[PDB]
Amino acid sequence: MNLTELKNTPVSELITLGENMGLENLARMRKQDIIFAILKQHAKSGEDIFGDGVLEILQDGFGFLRSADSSYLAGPDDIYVSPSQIRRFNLRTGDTISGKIRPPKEGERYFALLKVNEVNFDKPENARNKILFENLTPLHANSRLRMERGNGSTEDLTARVLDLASLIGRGQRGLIVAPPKAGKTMLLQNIAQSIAYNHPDCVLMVLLIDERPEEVTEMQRLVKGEVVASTFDEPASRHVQVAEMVIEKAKRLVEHKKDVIILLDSITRLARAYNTVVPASGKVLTGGVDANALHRPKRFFGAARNVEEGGSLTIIATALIDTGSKMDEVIYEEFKGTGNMELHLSRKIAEKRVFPAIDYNRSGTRKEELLTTQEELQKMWILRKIIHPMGEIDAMEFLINKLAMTKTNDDFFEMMKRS
Amino acid sequence: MNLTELKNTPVSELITLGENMGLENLARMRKQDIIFAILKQHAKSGEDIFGDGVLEILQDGFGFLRSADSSYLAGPDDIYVSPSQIRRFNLRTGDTISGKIRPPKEGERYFALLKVNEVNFDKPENARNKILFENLTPLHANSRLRMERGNGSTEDLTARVLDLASLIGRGQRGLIVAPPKAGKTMLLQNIAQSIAYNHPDCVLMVLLIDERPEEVTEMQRLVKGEVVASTFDEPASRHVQVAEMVIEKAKRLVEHKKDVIILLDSITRLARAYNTVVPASGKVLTGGVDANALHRPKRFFGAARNVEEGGSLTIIATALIDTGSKMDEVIYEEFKGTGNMELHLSRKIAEKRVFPAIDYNRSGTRKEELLTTQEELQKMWILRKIIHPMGEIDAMEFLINKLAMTKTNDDFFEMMKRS
Amino acid sequence: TALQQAFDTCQNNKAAWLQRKNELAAAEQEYLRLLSGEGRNVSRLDELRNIIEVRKWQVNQAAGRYIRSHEAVQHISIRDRLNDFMQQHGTALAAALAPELMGYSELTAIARNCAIQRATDALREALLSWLAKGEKINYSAQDSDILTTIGFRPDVASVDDSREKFTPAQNMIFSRKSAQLASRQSV
Ligand SMILES: Nc1ncnc2c1ncn2[C@@H]1O[C@H](COP(=O)(O)OP(=O)(O)OP(O)(O)=S)[C@@H](O)[C@H]1O
Ligand SMILES: Nc1ncnc2c1ncn2[C@@H]1O[C@H](COP(=O)(O)OP(=O)(O)OP(O)(O)=S)[C@@H](O)[C@H]1O
Ligand SMILES: [Mg+2]
Ligand SMILES: [Mg+2]
């Protein structure tokens, strides 16, 4: 069978399956221990079995094949990858490997692979001849990524607001900054649902840094696309390595002319984790952050681009402000002008409880002409001109009042232009 | 087989040539590694190979030779330069060197030089007998550097406004002060187009600091002169390295009575990089900037001068204001009166989407009498007198209307004086 | 041979404009077909909206270029025919308008312009009288066949597609979008 087939199963189905087959004790072990035990037994049974995962190279060329189902935790369930095939088939980090797998040899704690027959959703001989991600020439985003579901849902209005606030482009790089208790998580879920409901073809990835577990469990039961989240219990080293794994996976997927969308929460937390992990370079700036500490998050955030021949990587990240710690302010200042998309949330809008708490006047998208057709550029320009002088709380009140009564964005535009 | 010509060709042709030359893989690594493999294979074939580039001097004569195609990135494609050759032909940083190149022997992995056959686009013997840029007496700018394209296009309108706002000549030291999203990028585009179109003789180079990769690609694929850019992904050390390389190359070129033009975007980002790379001197000013940290950028911006002996060096560096970060206006205060030409842009005009958004009253040049003639000087004087009272938005609307009515600058002046 | 150059350039402009209208109609039809289908290709829908907008702009520009080319070829034909007819009958034409003509022969600039204006409005009422009695007018043989090939006036499909104007900002943004479309078609 496939490893993901029995790894994703609940603990109750796994316990019943382990007891039915007849292994002695199964109660006091983790997912990984039970999976390893049952897989070892099925290996000594003699039947042919398969395996799945994504590849990683250690500092000494040692290959580990993780799986995204288990939130990329490191354990013996990860598949052995000897240097022989990492050199023979020139694999690298972020590659997905599937094919014949091998029981662990006596003295080896890791299941091995006999051979590979499917890599990166393509035949192996074609996957070898590709183009490196950094060898591609970036572009401005031109393919519109509409967020309005059009089903007339209660939460869809929120998404509609974004379609009026800041444009979304395929392969665009963006930031949404918000103070605590402003609705970041709800907006992230709305974005994920819109992606899964309007553009099922594009690959959707959600990443959560050191988030408390209940929202994580909500994400695994709310978003159609796979979500990788590490709780704050795990150390910062795990945070940075899982971020590197996710970005490398996205780069490898984009290498095959496949659209990839990444939702990040939060980039400030990732920067803090990197500052914790990266050794001090002797130049500590204000806020107790190393000069080279923010270099890696800048690379991660700037990996988003749009390619000539096809494929694109869209990254939307959240940055925390007004949290009381001014090192977060320093991080936000360092990330002030990097993103094409700039969206702002404020506490004062959320105090009056109108949702989404979007600051319309100071939020926008640069180079938006290439994204959509002109006539709605003038429509949104008229709307922005008539909403700019008046206050933000009243702006949200007016927008929700005149948007709830309509049906779609074009209906809103026609209703506003007739009046 | 020139190294530069194979660098110009895209990656696909490199991979095709490698496959045709009996080289395996060479598809999942960076451009520099592919070029290194191709050059090694060609050297093993036995034919003579030659190259070119720009010199760099390390702290102990460990000389390197970079290429402007790769934005002066340190990679395997760089060419070794021994101290013996440096002491023999009297080289220094910024020298343009072309000649024979040598495959590496055992123990080293960098190409050497068999012999040099062109230094600074000149015979090596005549290159040694050149006066330093620091020993050349500066003067005020004499030759006017007209920006009017004259082809009767519609974007040239912006360039025409330049000829009405601030005169630019050979050796100007100019600052473009602008808020975010005011038209800096395509104003620089128009300036570069005018330089490459009206003045093909002068050397034009565009330096970009911590700019987004898409803007870098847009810059490279439009301008005629060679362009160098470092994205925000790279650390500030590379920003400093690239700026120093550009200024040294410009000094070496202008030492040969050449006209060099540099466009910098932005001097604020370069100042930030110098501040975060230079060790602290124990005296920090407002905004977290070290006292001597701004000494280095000023030198870069202080090289703009008109050499009496021959040639000139013009620098047009843009500056950011009203960005919400105190460091930016601290740097602007430290750079207020240092430049002899100023071009002020305002977000107020750009809000109404009237372009170019130029604060005409604040923008100007210093002692332009040495640049232009007299009768058109009084034409500009009376134009300024009649455009002084009304506000900047009304002034720009009137200016663009009148300029669209006429065809050329002389036609505009005659239409203004006849009415 | 300048007349032949104007003629075949006008023919090329006609062909290009007809072609552009052809793919504009094809794109509009396919967009409407996707609207008819239930399948939600929303990304393809926005892409098709962009395509139809940029191709409408291209059709407008091609129609305008056709209009200018047609005007240029008609002006060249007028120049040639009027020139040789006037070379034929200039003695009598100047005899009819002796005063102002020989005044322009030697006078001040303002007086010369006044004489030209008097000649022009004299021929004004002459031509108005001729067209008032209203005979039938025909071309000249070679120009007759050329201008029957190109027609008396450009097609109404060429004028109704140029009745709308574009601001220069729209002009170069649409040029960039058309270049991006060409690159996409190359892919
Ligand atoms: N569109 C929305 N509709 C209804 N309730 C919303 C909406 N957006 C936010 N809320 C409410 O706002 C509150 C905060 O939501 P969260 O997204 O969890 O806040 P947050 O931005 O994640 O800040 P943290 O993570 O708690 S520090 C909750 O009570 C939500 O129910
Ligand atoms: N001459 C012009 N003609 C038409 N549109 C213009 C002109 N100048 C500016 N614009 C518009 O104004 C904006 C200028 O964009 P950019 O020049 O990229 O901004 P910027 O000055 O580079 O600041 P950044 O780097 O984006 S924060 C775009 O939306 C352009 O469409
Ligand atoms: Mg949250
Ligand atoms: Mg810019």
Curated annotation (Swiss-Prot), chains A, B:
Write one Gene Ontology MF term.
ATP-dependent activity, acting on RNA
Q: Which HAMAP family match?
A: Rho
Organism lineage reads as: Bacteria, Pseudomonadati, Pseudomonadota, Gammaproteobacteria, Enterobacterales
UniProt record, GO biological process: DNA-templated transcription termination
Q: Which Pfam families match?
A: ATP-synt_ab (PF00006), Rho_N (PF07498), Rho_RNA_bind (PF07497)
- Protein name per UniProt: Transcription termination factor Rho
- Record entry for activity regulation: ATPase activity is inhibited by bicyclomycin and dihydrobicyclomycin.
According to its record, what is known about the domains?
A: Each subunit has two RNA-binding sites, one at the surface of the hexameric ring, and one at the center of the open ring structure, where RNA helicase activity is thought to take place.
Q: Name one GO cellular component term.
A: cytosol
Please report the stretch or stretches of sequence annotated as the Rho RNA-BD domain.
Answer: 48-123
Keywords assigned by UniProt?
A: ATP-binding, Helicase, Hydrolase, Nucleotide-binding, RNA-binding, Transcription, Transcription regulation, Transcription termination
Q: Which residues form a coiled coil?
A: none
UniProtKB/Swiss-Prot annotation, chain C:
Question: Which domain of life does the protein's organism represent?
Answer: Viruses
Gene3D superfamilies documented for this protein: Phage polarity suppression protein monomer
Q: Which UniProt keywords apply?
A: Late protein
The UniProt record lists the keyword Iron = no
Q: Which InterPro entries match?
A: Phage_P4_Psu (IPR010006)
| Entry's Gene Ontology BP terms | symbiont-mediated activation of host transcription
The UniProt function text for this chain reads: Late protein which functions to suppress polarity of amber mutations in the late genes of the P2 helper phage.
Q: What is this protein called?
A: Polarity suppression protein
Whose protein is this, by species? Answer: Enterobacteria phage P4 (Bacteriophage P4)
